[model samples]
Target chain A: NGIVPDAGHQGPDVSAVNGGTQVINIVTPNNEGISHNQYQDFNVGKPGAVFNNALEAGQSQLAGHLNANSNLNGQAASLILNEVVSRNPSFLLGQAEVFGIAAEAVLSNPNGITCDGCGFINTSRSSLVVGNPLFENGQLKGYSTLNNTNLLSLGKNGLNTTGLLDLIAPRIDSRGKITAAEISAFTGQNTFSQHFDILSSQKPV
Target chain B: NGIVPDAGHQGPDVSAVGTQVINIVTPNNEGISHNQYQDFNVGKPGAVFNNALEAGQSQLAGHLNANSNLNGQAASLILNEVVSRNPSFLLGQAEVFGIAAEAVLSNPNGITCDGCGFINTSRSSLVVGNPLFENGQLKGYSTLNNTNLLSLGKNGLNTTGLLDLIAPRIDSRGKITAAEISAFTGQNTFSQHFDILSSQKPV
Candidate 1:
């Protein structure tokens, strides 16, 4: 009955988040749609209508980053994460956007983005099936290497924030639910060249 | 007028630099064979010091990182810059021992040692072509960088504060010189792996 009033409802009403700050992000009618998008293109193959729908959704997404920066625990990787999470914490917390962005920023700063093995955040949809663990209040915990494991396998969820700045921006007693410190500690000492190698060769989105 | 003491060199040697530390790295056994080490085989083969003996008399060559710390900086980049003109101004830097321990205590809590690059203030042989730069006093007129083209190929000289610490400890300002800084900046960021890349394959 307070700030987060409900246990949350129906994947956050994007239109209602952040004073109407967030919308969904959808590609053109012919392109593959981002899984997180809400509205479908009823206009079918109409280029103008499809483009307009995508643009409108994009604006809402843009607003999401601009206004819904709350859910990212203050370090939302980038404006994208800020907006995305606010409109869809159920979706984001459903995946590991926090872990992906943290890994991305920490690795990206000295040079550019890389993707050796990706580190993802722990969410509602993912959990360990083996000897894996759950860090104390950590958003992203280390499991077996990122392969055919149930935890971070493909077709599961796609955003990784293992070493990004928004996630890595450190604090002592943040008590944040999405923790990326373990990931940073795991990969911070990597060199610019080595980091580049990992990022340049990862499976693309 | 300033070089001389108030009583013209009669003042007490009151540490002209107060508590501020300084760098003073020097190489002894100039013309002798065998590396400065008490013996020849102190370091293993394929390792950096393999040739410091026969080929090192004329220069400050080779770099490495070693520590017995239980904790580490937990992987962080370090920038060890100095600010001074006099040859003995202190650039008090901590040993990697301090940082590694902290990170171990808590995640993102430790201050990692810059195991990447170092200018052990004790082994420098400041030579000609080494540009001497300073930060304050007059801004923009930096005494360092490329245009200065400080050459590390200088002849040996008596150490201003030689033997200030035992050989193993990282040197204070009395040991690390502007010339060394000049030389180190030209290299890539500390890539601990690259050091090993030469000796072993990535696999």
Candidate 2:
């Protein structure tokens, strides 16, 4: 028996749009406390988009994030975009692995993000941003109306990424070893926009 | 300037005994929430013993095991021991570090750690048991029953290298927010003789 899925919602709505991007719209009330093996069926070989539509208030966001058993369906996605529509902070307690991803994995939330004891695999370019996703013509463009978000990582092992790691928040506090090929942390409230082809090469719009 | 040394007692009693170990006995009532920059000056290269002798039942928190700036002052000891005389040891948001020394932190009652970090050392260990003394001399520790230990950290305890946790009943709860842990380097043993009600992720 794996993690118990939410009984309130059926599951994530998986659909293909924007010429091949698999968009998964999860309509849960709270995305926190998701145990391991909850998202094992989420697989995509192409570009993927996951929308977390969880309610903000009346919950404690201090529980576990993605556990070790939570992973993609053994398929390396080209690009993975995880967008959250909640005001609660996001905490990653387990390993977020992308088996054979080519480009990037973007976890964008407007509130805040904390990678307490988390790791990444095969993710060359990883971004933990505090902004909402922007769309143009029903396609992913970037983020707009960025707010001041607090980012903290106090895990003993720190946030370990194989390649480049980016932390885009207004307030950043880290007390552990952040090991990466190259690490960058940006502060202040500004718009972050990017081109469609590459999630990298981000600039202010 | 650094942290203000406690005025209640005239600092820890630093002495040398047992052929060379430097014994440090702190008389503070409570040892929780101490800021950084507390220095411990041991004279030379020998085993250092840190003991907390606070009165119980009046304090709300545990004793301060170590701080980030706690150093041995240009001396590399072979072994270091930290013992508690109170009924509980609560290490909250404190950092325990050692410079070229092996350390052991023990308590006779129990230990409750939250946001407790550790720096690189030769080998570090934690023991929760009854202190055993022989002929007015400190010996080892013996296992006690019906004791409780709470290790709560929203970010979980970050540790490296060889670390040991020896207790009678080790109960780990879900108070741990982050579940992922790094690979421990050497062999780890949990010498729990009684029940272990653990909700923590396996190492």
Candidate 3:
């Protein structure tokens, strides 16, 4: 039916096995005459290597869908927040995209993921780094998570990322929130996207 | 008791008055041996509308706040009536026809009484200096002082219908509907003003 891969899938693009814009369905991964391929990248933090062994003969499901057809593209698209509601400030939409279709959503009433309030760092750039304390020699060291630099280092192929360096990065102050200086940098970013990304990337788990 | 006048109340006619134009109240401010007559001319403030009370109590009909009261060409008039209910009318056809200065309605507690607060249809203009809620409905026929959203918010317009229910502050004289709200005249809070009215509508 299909060639199996040893490693996992990567990036936001479509996988190779499907090779065409076709829909894949799953009945059982444990079918008797099926060849199991490896799982996608990123760790599975459970006891066993659980698998979605359902095999498609020549097609795979779209990771996500676009409601209308003939509307696929790789062009650089952008969404910019001109301002928050009613001369209000500091709410954000980071990096978001919806399927361009008749199904539309609205952004009203100024209460989305906000940053003007305290204790929450901005996370518009990176993934959430949530967890509790770690113990080393019976002493609590730090939480288990990657900082903005190293987390985004994966995207940069393992060098430091320049965008969300502080506040949302390992840049948190000992106060565990953004430092006063970092907040200035936070607001100083000319666009909301930068502010959103920095906060998003450095968001504590 | 009270000083009287020569001629009678002037312009700013009341439909309730004589069908044609003529002085209805005491001519030369004279009535009888009760009070002698002498008219106070240009630029007199205060101690006016003191008479609206005598008229209010002496008569209990709630028809007009002012009637046939011939007042004309004065600098300003201060009418502070302190009665406590809709005894009759607060300001009916009170002819404040051509005062060069401002006429102030400085009643602290909303005319104390109400029967259609100031349906002063005959006046050229009125300038309300303080907050006047005609039976809790802001009587919008005059220049509302110290206005707009922040003022509205600080004055509790956000939670109340003063913003939504009252006519748009900009065009207080104009009307609102499912269609539109007038533009905000103040700059500091124009944006806030827009959002509130637009929510009632949109563009």
Candidate 4:
């Protein structure tokens, strides 16, 4: 009853996945049955179009990542949260669009996009906020107009309700310090990481 | 220069992107040979392992003769060395938990080699060093991403990290979604091989 694949939809269509480069030629005809340099080309030739398409896909995936975030049943949710922290803490305060812009780093064609992957999202810029929103409780307080907001309230998702904000909330006390107690509640030892033979001698502060 | 864990070290070692717990305890008093717990524990003690590994042990079904990673990325190297020294490396119980959301998110594309090698995201873009594992699974299904393939590997090594994901070989037909891949621990989405002999050794 839910999402279903089309008939013979063998996984991701490799034909589509494989052939993103070749120029898709479309024939155009004039009223007189004659045409100038006229097979009007679309994305088949435009390099920018392909790059934009990936950012769009990445944007969608980011949103999807946030959507199902509350289910940290497995280590999945925390794993994703750790990645966000590793990538950029700002990303947590960002919206899907922020990642959408940030995704330029993963550009498929380095030389074509901007002549080497120099200044992509991974690089720091000024106004990366691309229409991100904020939240109040679980409800949308509204879109973020400025670059500032409540520390606890900030997240990719508004109100910091879903996703990492929601998941990492307990660890962060109102004091902004990550409480070892909070972490232990989840892992059981004040030094869950320390229990390991070597690396983490103390819990993450 | 980069986040690299050393042998005998453990706990959410954050030199890298995430956290992994490990412990190398031996069952012996001398702490030398035939150590009952000579192996390293890779995961946590409870639900994290229970929910993540699903084996209820919260640790990998394997162990380390030497030091290793909780995620099994670089740990594979030590495991290989140990295996070379002892073919029974597979016989130990090793379980670990660490950050893989990154792997699940961007690291796509691969080609197994002579029983052991690595799956690549693509060719000549950049993001090439993402880890690969045997049953290395990630969350979320990937849609047809053109730019995706060119960067992560481009040809399968490094174009950008995006293109590498573009053209991964099809091991089988039919829909395998993010849920299916992520279910490696929770659900048995993959079919069992009736003939073990025909299966690709340790893919």
Candidate 5:
């Protein structure tokens, strides 16, 4: 069994431990100082503190997935529109493999954390920003809860992404009688993945 | 009583003959040798020569009226096609006129006639040559009477016209048939003038 700091025992260890999520400030600090080793000399919310936590046995569990807080569907769609569907302003998205610096380089020599904080500014300048939005507000925003997990999907073929669903929730029993959470539980997994073929289509002249 | 011509009486001012048509031709070679009038000329295909037939006289009798032709239907139809109708290409005929003109033009200006009795033609031109075979020939040549006109009209517009004899004809009894036939008899003076308007066909 695995306990994901905030959500209770999450996985059977095979799946996840709340997927490296956190509770910024729970009732008691998760590290209620017994002062065992005092290995982490830096303060929390600092670059050194978060990374230093990444080195611990428990911090390895904190190797969480994250995406920008911004709605990347717009960005992704912008990339798709500018790069995929267009005839003039287009490129192959699947064929592209852009690299970000591990430590963001200012000019050629100066080095610094590219994304400095968890707000709009991020220290993950050189990190892999792949997959869907993984974290939000320092917690699992998308696809973390059963709620957001139902929001992943593939768009339509090429540019005709009409009527794509994230998850197929049952339509019945939503008749004003049910609570919001109850109604949400009836929903299905994220939008249809059939949109992948569309996102990955043959380019035409 | 209408006076007959050449009744062996003095004519009523022959020099002052009213509006008239005179068909002048030599009745015989002797008549041509002794021809006296300036209007006298060649003879028609058949008739005694030098016959000074005044067409407007009693020798030729026919009413001049509108909406009518004195000749047989075919001749009348030819005149209609030429004068009355004068259609360049018959639009709704479906078969006849379209086929004839289309076939003629299809000859591609092959043969041509010179103003003289000579022919001007390229050796390759088929039209310059006589047609050995064409589809438009009228059929049933031997079966028809050479002299008389044929009746193709099943429903003639005038009932009197459908009868072989007009009202004036005798039935072996030498008497006129009992019928009101002034219209078909070609006697209506103003056949062209329709004072009555047809109301049913209009909206």
Candidate 6:
């Protein structure tokens, strides 16, 4: 019964905006469940928005829900804000092809994260965290504290990215090979404020 | 019903040879079925036979059973003989660790083989074929007539072997990396009688 999301729950809400690099602000309901069909449900923003420079902000706010045995398939550049701790472990097994818009793709799930057969397409910088997302003045900062989490890769095709792959978790176990341009794993309890400084500084106005 | 062998079928027959390099003769019934648990069923010969050199010849004769969704998981140095054509495809997704005896590990399934994530240990030479196993006067020759088959590797590890990797098929499709000391793929329909001459002459 938990393999699929509830049919009654609506998908993420996308804000309608006019041309020229519109900011697609998505707000998902609390305890919103997801399944292997996450890509079909959360395909917000215009199709060719990245190529035409029509959209930049692909931010999503998710509730505290267990993404257990589910895959978060991405089609556009996004900054996911998963608030509160997840009840169960979150397993990501799909591709994150969000490289079009030269923005940082971050997934902050403080519960726990495990990836198997996950691949990332040309993202400028990708960050996966088991920490709370920090925001200041309505601007995404970084992460607060890394919780007790383990990022494990099992399949032959491990977590592979073409660009920078950043991971923040207490324990990281990699059974398969992880390929990336530059890989960084932070296992600390302190807050990271300047985590998104590089990309945030060059954000489109 | 094709996923499993018939209940009346008997497992491989092992000769009651005493210690040191025993030859376990495994002759199966016609149309033997296998599932994901091929290792559990075909674990003939002694458990420590490979380690103690208690077995060398792990020969088996299969009668044209389609290893469609089954994986031939190896537990010892063995030679296989598939008499006829398979009605379906054959996919391999397990490890073959037959390095203990320094013997040639060969799989001649003329049907087809698509390995996803297969690993091999230190076999002197490993041969995968889409051809029939040739024999002369009870001695294994090589193969004859490479058929239309594809040897594909899909996973990241692919078909990695620590020794020589020989492939004989009419058509070979490899998407993943195949690592070995030396790799050979024969893409011809001609009979290969002298294929195993190198290994056999040394024997």
Native-contact recovery for every candidate? 0.00, 0.00, 0.00, 0.02, 0.00, 0.00
DockQ of each: 0.01, 0.02, 0.01, 0.02, 0.00, 0.01
Task: Give the TM-score of chain B in candidate 1.
Answer: 0.17
Number of the predicted model whose TM-score against the real structure is largest: 2
**Model 1: per-residue lDDT, tens digit, B1-203?**
11111222112111112121111111111101111111111011111111111112211222322211102111111112212222211112212211110000000111111111112111222111121123311011111221122211122112211111110112221222221121222212111111111121123
Residue A135 CA displacement from its true place in model 2, Å: 1.6
Better of 2 and 3 by lDDT: 2
Steric clash count of candidate 5: 24
Report, for candidate 4, the interface RMSD. Answer: 22.5
Lowest-lDDT window of 10 residues in candidate 2 chain B? B28-37
lDDT of 3 by residue, B105-155 (tens): 321122211111111111121111222334533322321332321111111
Error of 5 at A168 (Å): 16
Predicted candidate 6 versus true structure: per-residue lDDT over A142-201, tens digit per residue: 665433434422233356666666666544444334555544444435466545321221
- The residue ranges of model 4 lying beyond 4 angstroms of the native Cα positions read A1-151, A154-166, A170-205, B1-58, B62-65, B68-172, B175-203
CA error at residue B49 for candidate 6, angstroms: 41
DockQ score of the complex predicted as candidate 3: 0.01
Residue A30, model 1, lDDT: 10
Model 5: per-residue Cα lDDT over A101-177, one tens digit each? 11110000011111112111112111111123223343322221113221111111111101111112211110001
Write one digit per residue (lDDT tens) for candidate 4, span B63-161: 223223222211101011110111111111122222111121122232211111011111111110122223322112222221122121111111111
lDDT (Cα, tens digit) per residue for candidate 6, span B111-183: 2334423334333333444323333122333433443332322211243443334444322222233332233
lDDT for position B143 in model 5: 9
Interface RMSD of each: 24.6, 15.3, 22.1, 22.5, 50.6, 17.4
Better model by TM-score: candidate 1 vs candidate 6: 6
C-alpha lDDT (0 to 100) for residue A162 of candidate 4: 11
Candidate 3: regions farther than 4 A off: A1-205, B1-15, B18-75, B85-95, B111-203
